[PDB]
C-alpha cells in the first residue's frame, strides 16, 4: 500500500468521558486529499462520522456527532485526530480512519482500527 | 448553488431492482463527486457509494458492493444508483449528495425518495 494508517488512542472509559482518537498516516502522504473517522458496532455497517480537508482543515460532521467530537489534523506530523467528548454506550464501536487520495472518489485506505468502549 | 432532485423508488418485491436517479441544476460544473446515502427508520444516514463527476470513479462500502451500481451522465446532469439483489433491510429513504471542487463532505443534499422492499 502506498499510504499506511494507524490507529490509537482508543480504550474504555465510563459514559460522560472522554477520549482522543489519533491516526498517523506514512507513505506518500502527499497523494492525500482528505481523511475520515468512521466507526463499527457489532454487527452492524461502518458509518461515516465526519472527515478534514489535508490541505486545508475544512471539515464536516454527520449529525450524530456533530457538537460532541472535533476531527483535526496536524499535518506537520501527517496525523489526524477525533476528541470524543460526553460519550454514550451507544458510541461503543471499533473507530477507523481512512485517507481519500486526491483525484480519486471514496474512501482508499483504511486503518486497522482502534477499540471504543462505552460503559454505563 | 446546485439544486438536486432525486426520481425513482417506491414499492419493490424482494429480491428485485430498482433505479433511482438525481439531477442537478444550477452551478454543475463546480461538481467534484456525487454520492448516495440512506437513512432506516429512526437511524442515522448512512454513506452509501460515490462517483466522480469528471473520471466516472466510483467507490462502494462493503455494505452495498457487488449489489449496487452508481453511474452518471454528465451530459444529462444526472446520476444514478441502480439497486439489483435487494433485501429487506435495504428499506430507507435515500438521499443523494454532490460535493463541490475543493470542499470536503456533502455540500448539498437532495430530499430523499423511499424505497420499500
Ligand atoms: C472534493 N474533492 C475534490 O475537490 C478533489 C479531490 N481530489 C481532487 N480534488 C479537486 N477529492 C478527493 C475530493 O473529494
Known amino acids: 500500500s502506498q499510504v499506511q494508517l494507524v490507529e490509537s488512542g482508543g480504550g474504555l472509559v465510563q459514559a460522560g468521558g472522554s477520549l482522543r482518537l489519533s491516526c498517523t498516516a506514512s507513505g506518500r502522504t502527499g497523494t492525500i486529499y482528505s481523511m475520515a473517522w468512521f466507526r463499527q458496532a457489532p454487527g452492524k455497517e461502518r458509518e461515516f462520522?465526519?472527515?478534514?480537508?489535508?490541505?486545508?482543515?475544512?471539515?464536516?460532521?454527520?449529525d450524530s456527532v456533530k457538537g460532541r467530537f472535533t476531527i483535526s489534523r496536524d499535518k506537520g506530523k501527517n496525523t489526524v485526530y477525533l476528541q470524543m467528548d460526553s460519550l454514550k454506550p451507544e458510541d461503543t464501536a471499533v473507530y477507523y480512519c481512512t485517507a481519500t487520495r486526491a483525484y480519486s472518489v471514496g474512501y482508499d485506505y483504511w486503518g486497522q482500527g482502534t477499540q471504543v468502549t462505552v460503559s454505563s | 448553488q446546485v439544486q438536486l432532485v432525486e426520481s425513482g423508488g417506491g414499492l419493490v418485491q424482494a429480491g428485485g431492482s430498482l433505479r433511482l436517479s438525481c439531477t442537478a441544476s444550477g452551478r454543475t460544473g463546480t461538481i467534484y463527486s456525487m454520492a448516495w446515502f440512506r437513512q432506516a427508520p429512526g437511524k442515522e444516514r448512512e454513506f452509501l457509494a460515490t462517483?466522480?463527476?469528471?473520471?466516472?470513479?466510483?467507490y462502494y462500502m462493503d455494505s452495498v458492493k457487488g449489489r449496487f451500481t452508481i453511474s452518471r451522465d454528465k451530459g444529462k446532469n444526472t446520476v444514478y444508483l441502480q439497486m439489483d439483489s435487494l433485501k429487506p433491510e435495504d428499506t430507507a429513504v435515500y438521499y443523494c449528495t454532490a460535493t463541490r471542487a475543493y470542499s470536503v463532505g456533502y455540500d448539498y443534499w437532495g430530499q430523499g425518495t423511499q424505497v420499500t422492499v
Open positions: 462517483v466522480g463527476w469528471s473520471s466516472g470513479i466510483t
